[PDB]
Design a protein around this ligand. Structure first.
Ligand SMILES: O=C(O)c1ccc(/N=C/c2c(-c3c(Cl)cccc3C(F)(F)F)noc2-c2cc[nH]c2)cc1
Length: 242
């Protein structure tokens, strides 16, 4: 049934639109709005721990939007809670990292952060320059594809719905969702004459390794300087915080 796959594309893109935080038109319109040298120095002089508090708050919010995205994916709520948590634990921050490329400007290597665009030197006080550089580099590689909003929506749905995640109890049910999302993505790329991006997408293991380094650093900061989380998803919170 072709209309079932067309309906799936529509529903995935709708969930993405309802959870994507900033509209692409707003991000693009703000590209000329760049932090001044005075404003960059103000961020660099902030305590590591204040920048950590700010970034942790932004990342928690971003994860929560990804959870809402997943909750609206067809069939996700029909998975058992164990498998929902397995998939979100493994993939929600990977989706956050992919979503960042929308807010990245490859021409001056800046990201939209707290209302204006700034380079990675904005984050100097965190003392994480290698991680920050890796995140910027990863956003650069995606942004060069000119990833469309529907491409991000369908691709990030597949980042989440991955039947190979260790620990799933109902692997056949996740497989069925994955196959339908794969078909939705590939059908959409053919319709829009964008199958050329398939060979240019991040290779196997690159997003995994970047996310692993990223979450490891967040866990170190949270151990040294715990933040208060506006916790909305107790089963997921319990897996990440201790
Ligand atoms: O509302 C809720 O219940 C809820 C629950 C969990 C949330 N995020 C957990 C985080 C964090 C993280 C962040 Cl975002 C900030 C500070 C410290 C961390 C730390 F690393 F300590 F966990 N990093 O990766 C994840 C993650 C989530 C799914 N897969 C990976 C957010 C909101």
């Amino acid at each position: 049934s072709l209309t079932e796959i067309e309906h799936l594309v529509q529903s995935v893109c709708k969930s993405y639109r309802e959870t994507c935080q900033l509209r692409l038109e707003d991000l693009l319109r703000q590209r000329s709005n760049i932090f001044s040298r005075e404003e960059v120095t103000g961020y660099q002089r902030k305590s590591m721990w204040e920048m950590w508090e700010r970034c942790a708050h932004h990342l928690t919010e971003a994860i929560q939007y990804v959870v809402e995205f997943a909750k609206r994916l067809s069939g996700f709520m029909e998975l058992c809670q164990n498998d929902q948590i397995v998939l979100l634990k493994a993939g929600a921050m990977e989706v956050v990292l992919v979503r960042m490329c929308r807010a990245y400007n490859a021409d001056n290597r800046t990201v939209f952060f707290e209302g204006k665009y700034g380079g990675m030197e904005l984050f100097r006080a965190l003392g994480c320059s290698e991680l920050i550089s890796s995140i910027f580099d990863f956003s650069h590689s995606l942004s060069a594809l000119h990833f469309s909003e529907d491409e991000i929506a369908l691709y990030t749905a597949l980042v989440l719905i991955n039947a190979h995640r260790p620990g799933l109890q109902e692997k056949r049910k996740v497989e069925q969702l994955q196959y339908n999302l794969e078909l939705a993505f590939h059908h959409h790329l053919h319709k829009t004459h964008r199958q050329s991006i398939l060979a240019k997408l991040p290779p196997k293991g690159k997003l995994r390794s970047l996310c692993s380094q990223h979450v490891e650093r967040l866990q170190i900061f949270q151990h040294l300087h715990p933040i208060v989380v506006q916790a909305a998803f107790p089963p997921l919170y319990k897996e990440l915080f201790s």
